[model samples]
Target: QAAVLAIATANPPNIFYQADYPDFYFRVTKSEHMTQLKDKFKRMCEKSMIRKRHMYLTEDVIKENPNIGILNAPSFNARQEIMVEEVPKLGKEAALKAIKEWGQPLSKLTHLIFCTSSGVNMPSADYHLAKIMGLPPYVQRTMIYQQGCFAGATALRLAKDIAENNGGHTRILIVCVELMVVCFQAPSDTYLDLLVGNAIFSDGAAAAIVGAPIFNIVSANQTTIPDSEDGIVGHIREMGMKYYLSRTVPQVIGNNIVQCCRDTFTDWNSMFYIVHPGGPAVLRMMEEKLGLSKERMRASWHVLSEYGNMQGPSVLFILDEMRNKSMEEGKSTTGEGLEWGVMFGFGPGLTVETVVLRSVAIN
Candidate 1:
């Protein structure tokens, strides 16, 4: 079958407000009158003034991560100390439990894939998750670590392939979690965060479930539709992951989103777009390029504004929004029905991954 099955997602926690802060930092930073201290240092320390931290903390800050210093650190080498000290707080045992409780139910799944770049985990967090989730003892497991943003979409492709070949009932589960605030260094100036980075980038987790698509028209089901092209998900090593300050990012993403959309969705009207709201600009660039109506990209904007940017699983989270819309609106139900799905994610590597999913129910 060339069509996709179904798509669903799970979010990490609260529907945080732009002004909320991560509570986890309480263990280490203890009682620093955080908000006040943040302001004090930004205004007082010249070299230590971290504006990005202020912006990040003032906006929906991840409660589990408290160090604004790591985020504004000018020197990554020196920032290592802050990250190392903050890791325990950022990487909560609660996370392990959350994965287990939420993940175990997905254990019946046949294929499992996960992503994470915030922590140094061996056997990978997905592996541990597999055990906690109690995924089928024989189910396939794949862990994509240190891949920054593109990891979620990349894993989806991998899982989609598994579903395509695994003749029997194959359920693919994807886990995407990022806690970048843990790496925040102190005494760094706010201006160093570079444009978009200071405004977006929050800590959160996302999960997705995908399977083969069922078509009522042909009465023929499909698994994976096709493969994405070369330009879609690129990681230019020489250039590195940080796109801040560089004007090239918007241009690069603008051009690539259009190309990737074509690569994945030849039939745009018939397909659904589940895109990561990297920021307002990235979303707008794609919407303009694809000629999508304002309403068409509504889900993207909603997720971005409400959840900040969950990064890795941002698309998965958006897919959840689309699913809610479909279920509520009865828009597109079958993969091969009148409406299909085009899922894509863009991140460091200047990478983008695109995948298509069809619905199982049709009106």
Candidate 2:
């Protein structure tokens, strides 16, 4: 199976804090009807546990362009135009961070898997990313689109297969970038879905390097560390994914996910969970259904609090948090050094995906 050598994430320059959202929300929605729901909207954002979010669009941009209509929103052509131009900028920042941290030459990457649910463009972000990174002309490329939040897990699974089926020389670079703010809808004042989505969704990018080869450890944005040969991140033991055709609640997905885990592993007690923070309610429901304690899901909650829900790339951010935690504790061995890890992500179609990974030595 593919082993993760390094992972890194990047966020756009515009950072929005929950405390300032009330004014920002008011600026975006001029209607008295929408303004009347300010308290309700504030409550949603507050309860989401998302303290801040990053985006390309800023408060100044929205304020100066209040003419940018709501309710009707933007046309697909306009949104796509903006995404095509902006997505690559953020995606490249993330991909380069991971590559530099992995300390591997661009020519060494055998495959490039780009995952996103937020935008589309000609030549796609993956192609643009390869050009930006100066990858070898023969490097294989795959684009995963419209898969929602679970796409990160999906990308990892594909990378695992490629690394395992191919030779140890094969290395896959997986990048997930999302611009959830682009899907904004005008607040219906009383509609819950729009309110919840607007409150939680944000922009972020993440990149991970996966392969069977051993490598030295490096910081997220810098060169390799000295004496870091003993550093290890994570290794894939197994991955399972399931999808439901219709809209479903956390309870349903949680139960189905439980069954999948049961079938995949004989024992679940040994695993550490890195679950997507779909929302506070979804997290709670999953916790109850999966019989997990609050402390076990701290990383998920932490990511949500810091960056909200970044859609396709959120879970990867959570994994990076897990990696930092392991590093902080100075444990660098697989299975024996750190507890087994179970990462989960949820997306549209009520898709449920999980990857079981274990920490291991670098060599």
Candidate 3:
């Protein structure tokens, strides 16, 4: 069976979230009376790495293009408002560019899956990328759009399917994007709109390749995260691309992950697990729920500290970290000597999507 390898990431620009956003403070109301409020808000924002200029769009960009919607970081913006001329412009070249980088190492790719919600276009990233990356025009193509945060897991699951059935001889590329920068709401008159507007979401993209070496060599390796259907993660309102990030997102995550881990490991003594590093809160919650000591989740904390949240690609970062571990130990990368991959994600559903990747041995 051929090993389904996760290739290295090519961040168009390796964005360092901590360095990029160190503080967040807006002009205080009733300056003398609101010192405490300012300090608390500042601390919260900084803890979350939500700086004032973190997701700020330049006024020039907004003036140049009025239709662009900007998703701000979790802070008050009192200084300036920035915008873009065309919201779609954010998606145009970024997707093509990301695929170009991800596709370069694919001398043996057999298929492609593209996913995103931030932008859309005809002959979308999938087709444009075939030309951009010089992928064989005959390689099968699948594009998933507007599925929101779980979309990345969706793509990975679909990639597993493609690899399983396509003669067990095809390679597949999965592209996931969250060009959060593109969906702009015309600046509203209210501060509530403005405050939520301050939420920080960046333009991001990720591509992965999956293929079964011989076939499903491990477990059946296909399952979705159970009990993740209640929270509102991402919503499309007439106003624009608004998200429902519930206060209890982390609680839902903490309560469920341990059981999921136990269930997956019920028949085995130990197994390698790839959990997405969503952020500090989710990570901490998961650490407690899964009974993982701080040392056990160093890679996850590292990714969160470094990248903030790439949304869909955060899981890729975790997967990449695990792959490195297997290489260091000189052991087959699949978990539990089972020759398979376990994949999952946390998104707006306050949801989790997981898949068991059945590996096929190669060489």
Candidate 4:
């Protein structure tokens, strides 16, 4: 089995309180004239369960580049430029912390599994990240490009295989970074998804090592809910990356998540959960669908409250947070005393990714 050895998360230096974001977002986009939408966006922020979100889209960054927030204007190049500079560096910040906690020299790192949606460079974010981290030329690398929120889970699922099949020689580093700088824009009534994304999605990076045991990954599975490919869509176009998170997404997941859960564990209540915090409502939907109590879902909610929705890094952040709380509360295992737990990552493809995890006693 492949186990998560260490995990860490990092975010940009600029922090915006959610209470002040509607005003900040409008001011940055020069959209105060859209009073109704701005007011509606305020309400979205209020209930987002996101108290604060760190962003690479500082006021100065957005204000200096006036075209990026302009609706329908071709600004892809402008957006790509910042992400090319920011993503790998932030990933390195988190990676360094994870490597330290793993208690291994960087030279022992055998594989790099990097994921991101905002990377635009031709050589890819993984290549740049490896170079910046001074990873050995022989360290095998894999890049997950354009996968949305489920990307981290995809990376871990891949890491599990790599570690378990490598005759105990594998030491995999998984890194994911998301920057709203690439997708930030003005509020428009025509696009509710962007408005919702604007309310919650922000910038951050998270990394984890897969080697010795902490949460031993026992099994993993992925399923695409039928006929829902268009439920959530993302595209990089003239005006930057556009994301459409349909209102039907929570409903769609709520409708199908039961089977996904049942396929892994027979008794739902016996297992703890580490699910992606797509949003407060999505978390509610997941809990309702699984008939899980609020306590079972606290780590997911806590990550959302602290960091907002960070796409690929979000689930890994929850995993790290869950482990922290277990230690804080003096629980026997990282899964809050429950040995069996599950990790769920949701995103485009209406995809539901599941990893069944078995927590080991702290050693």
Candidate that scores best on TM-score: 4
Q: Mind giving the per-residue lDDT tens digits that candidate 3 earns over 226-250?
A: 5555454454543345554545656
Model 1 Cα lDDT, one tens digit per residue, 1-363: 423233344443443333323233322334345565455433322221111221123223423333333433243332233333333333333234433533445445676676766544555666666665455578777777766566767776776557667754776666676654434333223434322343355665555555553321112211221222222232212112233334355566667777766654433544556677765667677777777767667777777766666667677657667656665776546322345666667665556666665556744
In candidate 1, position 204 carries an lDDT of 56
Rate residue 293 of model 2 by lDDT: 63
Candidates in descending TM-score order: 4, 2, 3, 1
Off by over 4 Å in 2: 63-68, 213-248, 267-269, 331-337, 361-363
TM-score between model 1 and native: 0.66
Which stretches in model 4 have alpha-carbon errors above 4 Å? none
Query: lDDT per residue, candidate 2, 97-195, as tens digits?
Result: 888988978788999999876666669988988887788898899999777778888887778778878988998999898875356555664444556
In order, what lDDT does every prediction score? 0.51, 0.69, 0.50, 0.87
lDDT of 3: 0.50
Task: Write the candidate numbers in order of decreasing lDDT.
Answer: 4, 2, 1, 3
Displacement of the residue 360 alpha carbon in candidate 2, Å:
1.5
- Output the lDDT of residue 163, model 1: 63
CA error at residue 179 for candidate 3, angstroms:
2.1
- Total residue pair clashes for candidate 4: 0
Going through the candidates in order, what is the number of backbone clashes in each? 31, 3, 24, 0
